[PDB]
Scaffold this motif. Sequence first.
Motif, short mmCIF file in Angstrom:
data_model
loop_
_atom_site.label_atom_id
_atom_site.label_comp_id
_atom_site.label_asym_id
_atom_site.label_seq_id
_atom_site.Cartn_x
_atom_site.Cartn_y
_atom_site.Cartn_z
N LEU A 32 34.12 -24.66 -16.26
CA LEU A 32 32.84 -24.30 -15.67
C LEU A 32 31.92 -25.49 -15.56
N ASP A 33 31.03 -25.42 -14.57
CA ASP A 33 30.01 -26.43 -14.34
C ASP A 33 28.76 -26.05 -15.13
N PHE A 34 28.50 -26.78 -16.21
CA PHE A 34 27.32 -26.51 -17.05
C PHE A 34 26.08 -26.99 -16.33
N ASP A 35 25.15 -26.08 -16.10
CA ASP A 35 24.03 -26.30 -15.18
C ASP A 35 22.71 -25.99 -15.85
N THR A 36 21.99 -27.02 -16.28
CA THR A 36 20.68 -26.82 -16.90
C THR A 36 19.57 -26.45 -15.89
N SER A 78 21.50 -18.09 -5.22
CA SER A 78 21.59 -19.14 -4.21
C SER A 78 21.14 -20.44 -4.86
N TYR A 79 21.82 -21.54 -4.55
CA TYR A 79 21.52 -22.82 -5.16
C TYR A 79 20.88 -23.77 -4.17
N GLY A 80 20.41 -24.90 -4.68
CA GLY A 80 19.60 -25.83 -3.91
C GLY A 80 20.35 -26.53 -2.80
N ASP A 81 21.68 -26.48 -2.85
CA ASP A 81 22.49 -27.10 -1.81
C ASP A 81 22.92 -26.08 -0.76
N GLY A 82 22.37 -24.87 -0.84
CA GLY A 82 22.66 -23.84 0.13
C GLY A 82 23.85 -22.95 -0.21
N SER A 83 24.52 -23.24 -1.32
CA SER A 83 25.68 -22.44 -1.73
C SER A 83 25.21 -21.17 -2.43
N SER A 84 26.10 -20.19 -2.55
CA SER A 84 25.73 -18.92 -3.16
C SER A 84 26.94 -18.14 -3.65
N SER A 114 31.39 -20.90 1.07
CA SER A 114 32.49 -21.79 1.44
C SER A 114 32.61 -23.01 0.53
N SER A 115 31.49 -23.60 0.12
CA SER A 115 31.59 -24.82 -0.69
C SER A 115 32.17 -24.54 -2.07
N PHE A 116 31.97 -23.34 -2.60
CA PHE A 116 32.62 -22.98 -3.86
C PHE A 116 34.12 -22.82 -3.65
N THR A 117 34.52 -22.10 -2.61
CA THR A 117 35.93 -21.97 -2.28
C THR A 117 36.61 -23.33 -2.15
N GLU A 118 35.93 -24.25 -1.48
CA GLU A 118 36.44 -25.59 -1.23
C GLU A 118 36.51 -26.48 -2.47
N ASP A 119 35.79 -26.10 -3.53
CA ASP A 119 35.78 -26.84 -4.80
C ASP A 119 36.84 -26.28 -5.77
N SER A 120 38.12 -26.63 -5.58
CA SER A 120 39.19 -26.03 -6.37
C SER A 120 39.07 -26.30 -7.86
N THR A 121 38.32 -27.35 -8.22
CA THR A 121 38.20 -27.75 -9.63
C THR A 121 37.12 -27.01 -10.42
N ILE A 122 36.25 -26.26 -9.74
CA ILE A 122 35.16 -25.55 -10.40
C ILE A 122 35.43 -24.05 -10.40
N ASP A 123 35.64 -23.50 -11.60
CA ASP A 123 35.99 -22.08 -11.76
C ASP A 123 34.76 -21.18 -11.94
N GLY A 124 33.58 -21.78 -11.94
CA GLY A 124 32.34 -21.06 -12.11
C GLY A 124 31.27 -21.94 -12.69
N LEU A 125 30.12 -21.33 -13.01
CA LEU A 125 28.97 -22.01 -13.58
C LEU A 125 28.59 -21.41 -14.93
N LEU A 126 28.05 -22.26 -15.80
CA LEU A 126 27.46 -21.80 -17.04
C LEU A 126 26.03 -22.31 -17.08
N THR A 220 21.56 -30.80 -14.98
CA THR A 220 22.93 -31.30 -15.05
C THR A 220 23.79 -30.80 -13.90
N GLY A 221 23.36 -29.73 -13.24
CA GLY A 221 24.11 -29.18 -12.12
C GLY A 221 23.82 -29.79 -10.76
N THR A 222 22.91 -30.76 -10.72
CA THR A 222 22.61 -31.48 -9.49
C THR A 222 23.19 -32.89 -9.61
N1 LIG Z 1 28.40 -26.44 -3.51
C1 LIG Z 1 29.04 -25.61 -4.51
C2 LIG Z 1 28.71 -26.00 -5.91
C3 LIG Z 1 29.40 -26.57 -6.89
C4 LIG Z 1 28.53 -26.70 -8.01
C5 LIG Z 1 27.35 -26.19 -7.64
C6 LIG Z 1 26.03 -25.98 -8.29
F1 LIG Z 1 26.01 -26.44 -9.53
F2 LIG Z 1 25.06 -26.57 -7.64
F3 LIG Z 1 25.70 -24.70 -8.35
O1 LIG Z 1 27.43 -25.75 -6.33
#
Ligand SMILES: NCc1ccc(C(F)(F)F)o1
Length: 330
Positions: A32-36, A78-84, A114-126, A220-222
Amino acid sequence: STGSATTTPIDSLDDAYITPVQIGTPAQTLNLDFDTGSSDLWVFSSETTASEVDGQTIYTPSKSTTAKLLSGATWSISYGDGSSSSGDVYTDTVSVGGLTVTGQAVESAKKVSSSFTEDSTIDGLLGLAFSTLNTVSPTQQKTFFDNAKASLDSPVFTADLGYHAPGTYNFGFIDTTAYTGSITYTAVSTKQGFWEWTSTGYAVGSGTFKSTSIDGIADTGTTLLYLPATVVSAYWAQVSGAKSSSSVGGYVFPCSATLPSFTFGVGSARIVIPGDYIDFGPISTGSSSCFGGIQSSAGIGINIFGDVALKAAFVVFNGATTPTLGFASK
Ligand SMILES: NCc1ccc(C(F)(F)F)o1
């Protein structure tokens, strides 16, 4: 109690960092991507639209004897890069680096962008921001840190991100061997749900320090460091050929450049970001135009001390009754 887990860059640019997390019984380990900067713990799962899964490890609650559907609960973020992403919610046992929380809300994705789908290495966020930002409805849920806090030896976690290398997230203790000098603590506002603080200023390269208050969030998530246009212009003006490109979406610079360092203030202390940390490589494969790691926050509405800044420091997220942030060199 305490926990300690290694966090690893997902690629050669440190675009993000992943940390292994054990979910359920028997354990299912997801990275998981640890996101403060957010407050939802969500995962790719057996419920995620099949066409939106491309290589991620999924959580299957039906295979966990401790999983329980949190009836009626949904989430959408929804996140700051437009992903959701969005879905429903289970509670289950979650462990990070030996620290275990029972009854943690684990948000199961039905849909991801789509950007989450495309990120095969990230299984989610914490999420590790304040629980007031958690999106679960109709009953808001607590973050992993908030659930663990009472049990921790000290109500803190620390981020020690590596430059092109692994680093560490610790929970419940400060590793006094992981930094040099002293930790400088600074006030936090939780009014927007973030670890929001005010830097005391900046310098570019060997230049003089400019004392000026810069309000922003430790996130940490940016990936990058997002600062006011004035500050960012002063930085890139020291790099021959650097320019802001609307077509690329930010400052780019000749890949042949040697980048200057960037210093930010924490009270009377100073954190120095080496120039190499500000290089995010060719804008496209084979290009001699490189993307900059310091970008303007104009249009975001907040300044963001993302990984480019945080990885230059040992960072203490102090979740005492009055939260504070600590920064040390390392
Ligand atoms: N663009 C997808 C993605 C990977 C990681 C993240 C997030 F941390 F910003 F939420 O968003």
